[model samples]
Target: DKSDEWKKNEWNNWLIKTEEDWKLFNTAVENKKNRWLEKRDKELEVWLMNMQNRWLHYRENEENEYKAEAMKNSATWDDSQWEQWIKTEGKKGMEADLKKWLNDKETFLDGWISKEWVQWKNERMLQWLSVDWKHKEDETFEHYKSSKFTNVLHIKKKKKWTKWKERTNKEKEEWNNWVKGKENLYVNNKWDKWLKWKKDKRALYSQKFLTFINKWISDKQWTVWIEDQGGS
Candidate 1:
């Protein structure tokens, strides 16, 4: 135990405070241990080499840890957008569109990253972080994004239009009058708009009206070739 303590003190003592102080501590360590030992310079030289290798190994471990954390973060910069691309693009492409409408998504990165931050087997080198990686990932993503075609999406107003077909001509006229009133309205709550129930309700209801207007503009509304007499 006393030998171990002496070694520890000499180790820290030799490691700093200037080159002259460094040599003094090592020379003192040799003199202290030489009473029972022979050829002090050779014995101390062997000991010195053993400790120098240990310091190198320990510092390499510390450096690897810092690099792992920093590179892990940089690798996932557009992770959320990739998740969106995977779901929205994949969902829109397959016959599984309606099936995937609200089904389980491909696992997102936050959970995967948090769970396995230190677990990647194929981490990139520090040189890759500085240069070659940027263009490589972009090309990887381009090929990833290019194949998932989602241009086949179109929603008809069939449900809302079917509801429209059930209304009688008089009721239809009243609906038109109600919407006309909505269109010409003035805002009295410009500053008091914290929770304007009527104003907010109209905004909330705007999409339904917009759906109907889309049907009208697309000429998909129920046809009435005549006026009044059930619009006959």
Candidate 2:
């Protein structure tokens, strides 16, 4: 009996509304179409407006909370002690601390969204896209690569360096010493210095890495997908 809701005469009359109203309804039905499309644009505008207000509210509240916490933590310090901290830590340290605080705020916001916002948004998106979550295929790096997403391309390139950084001797030694009682002092700037030294040691070798990658891709007939922007 519940399945007959849409078969009601009222539902039929609702569908017979003007072409403009139908267009609006259809646009809402096809939200995945670009935001500029006539049917979908108003929905996107409303959603974006609400999102903007929510973000502003969250940001203001978070900033006030951070200020209160900072004041509480530093309340015991005198002016001289504050000056000393600034002098010892330098501008970079202050910047790093602020960046960490911002990251924490973002993490908290993400947790809230995950717990409350994502389910409703996902349900709406699935309905609008006419897609079922139960049957959706898992997306892979190759799928993203073929889609020509620039950020995905950057992520692939960054993965090689990320792996190298994780495995570098300095990183390994630091972790080993931390976990075990191994006597190892991580060399200051060792990985960065080594990379810089290598670049200077053989200019041609540095360039060759890039050339090899381009040639490898070209040989595999993937030249169209892989760009060669010349110089290393």
Candidate 3:
């Protein structure tokens, strides 16, 4: 509790309106200024050190989040390509191909980490925003392309017969027309699988067609010449 008399009579006496008044006030203030300024400088140093430590922690957390998301996305992104490669390369070289695929995933994620760090760090340092960048995931695993069917059909001929009787020219022409019309059979049977009308109908129709081809065209009886079309 301060009295008005003490404030007016005592405090007002130290007012530095003249050079002589300032000289008298300066000695008293200087006595405390040295210690006060030193403590303030040290406080600033401590605060700056604390900010540096916090910035490092922020950087580590953001980087970890970036990598975590990237790792999840890489698998999904490469899934279709992986399946295609597996089908094309076959199981014979799976061990090596799988190893390379996994290695390439790491390579992709690491590259993302480095490239994004450059942009992220600069933006965060420049401003106050520090949200970690996210990985872009693929919406679907299916490959797509649009092209019309071509007319050049290349059917491979069978080898020499063991005990099979040869077909006549008329029989061969009839077989060719039947085979040409069989494309419609395939398209119609494919719709069964697509519409889920009969799950195994397409495969059954394929086997029936193979049997017909083997009976008519193949030199080896009961043997179907199947060609591998990978991952279609």
Q: Which candidate number has the best lDDT?
A: 2
lDDT of each: 0.33, 0.35, 0.32
Which pairs in model 1 have colliding backbones? none
Candidate 1: list runs displaced more than 4 Å.
1-195, 225-232
TM-score of 1: 0.14
- Minimum summed lDDT over a 10-residue window in model 3 is located at 133-142
Which pairs of residues collide in model 2? none
- Candidate 1 per-residue C-alpha lDDT over 98-117 given as tens digits, one digit per residue, 9 for 90 to 100: 22321221122223332332
117-175 in candidate 3: lDDT tens per residue? 34533442333112121011011111211111122342322221100113123333543
Q: Select the stronger candidate by lDDT from 2 and 3.
A: 2
Q: What is the lDDT of residue 60 in candidate 3?
A: 24
Off by over 4 Å in 3: 1-92, 128-232
Ranking by TM-score: 2, 3, 1
